[PDB]
Design a protein around this ligand. Structure first.
Ligand SMILES: *CCC(=O)Nc1ccccc1-c1cnc2[nH]ccc2c1
Length: 293
């Protein structure tokens, strides 16, 4: 049930090499560019598929050309079997690198640095009027190039939603909106099936880091969406920060004090990182855990 078989050629330029991603709403593929000879990420959506998501993916991707932490947009096109998008290919994702770590934990060096780069791409997308809503390790990756290999990127805009309007006002929230994502990094907003904000992409960020440092989350074992929520709804979030820098009592207070509407203070959270980095002699020119330096 693969949309393209190998050695298929889209638009006489992109020879499919293998599948690399699947899911409900599309398949992803490594392709050789036959024009420019580099390889590339070709994502594809069935033409008939009900939930025409890819197109909206390609709008976010296009508004974000210019920004860092975004794959270069190569091309898109549709025909009577599948719609396609072409973009730059990236390296190991964070989930996979995190598991590679002996203890399943990054140093605080690598965590705080990742922190800074993930937060930019979040602000970035907020800036062009979209929530990611599905923020997780496996949704970020590293470059594979001299020019990018120490660069962490953002993948998927599948679950993305616009929160503004044509001008720049905040769309009104739905009275309900059913969480459609990954439980482990879901806010309590999402568990309560309330319309997600920019703060909810920042809750996700918060929990991602805690797991990169500490190496686990309280609920990591559970897969019941409802349970997890009830635990997260009852848990003391300061208990996570017991082995984490004291600058993360601010990040937590800040996001616990936001709603849908209220814009987050991105600079504040960018400091919690840069301060904690400083009170620890951590430089950006430091190696990452996976590096063999
Ligand atoms: C530059 C993009 C990259 O390396 N990864 C990628 C490439 C091509 C298509 C998709 C992705 C991607 C998109 N959405 C996703 N949702 C879950 C996982 C992914 C990966």
């Amino acid at each position: 049930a693969d949309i393209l078989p190998a050695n298929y050629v889209v638009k006489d330029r992109w020879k499919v090499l293998k599948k690399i991603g699947g899911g409900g709403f599309g398949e992803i593929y490594e392709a050789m560019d036959l024009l420019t000879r580099e390889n590339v990420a070709l994502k594809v959506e069935s033409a008939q598929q009900p939930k025409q998501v890819l197109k909206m993916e390609v709008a976010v991707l296009k508004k974000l050309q210019g920004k860092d932490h975004v794959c270069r947009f190569i091309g898109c096109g549709r025909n009577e079997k599948f719609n396609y998008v072409v973009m730059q290919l990236q390296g190991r994702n964070l989930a996979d690198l995190r598991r590679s770590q002996p203890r399943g934990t990054f140093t605080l060096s690598t965590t705080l640095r990742l922190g800074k780069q993930i937060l930019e791409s979040i602000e970035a997308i907020h800036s062009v009027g979209f929530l990611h809503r599905d923020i997780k390790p496996s949704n970020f990756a590293m470059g594979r190039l001299p020019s990018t290999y120490r660069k962490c990127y953002m993948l998927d805009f599948g679950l993305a939603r616009q929160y503004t309007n044509t001008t720049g006002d905040v769309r009104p929230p739905r009275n309900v909106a059913g969480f459609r994502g990954t439980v482990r990094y879901a806010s309590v907003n999402a568990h309560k099936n309330r319309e997600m904000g920019r703060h909810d992409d920042l809750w996700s960020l918060f929990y991602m880091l805690v797991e990169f440092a500490v190496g686990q989350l309280p609920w990591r074992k559970i897969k019941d969406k409802e349970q997890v929520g009830m635990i997260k709804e009852k848990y003391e979030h300061r208990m996570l920060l017991k082995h984490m820098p004291s600058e993360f009592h601010l990040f937590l207070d800040h996001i616990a004090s936001l709603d849908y509407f209220t814009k987050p203070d991105y600079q504040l959270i960018m400091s919690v990182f840069e301060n904690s980095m400083k009170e620890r002699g951590i430089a950006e020119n430091e190696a990452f855990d996976w590096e063999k330096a």
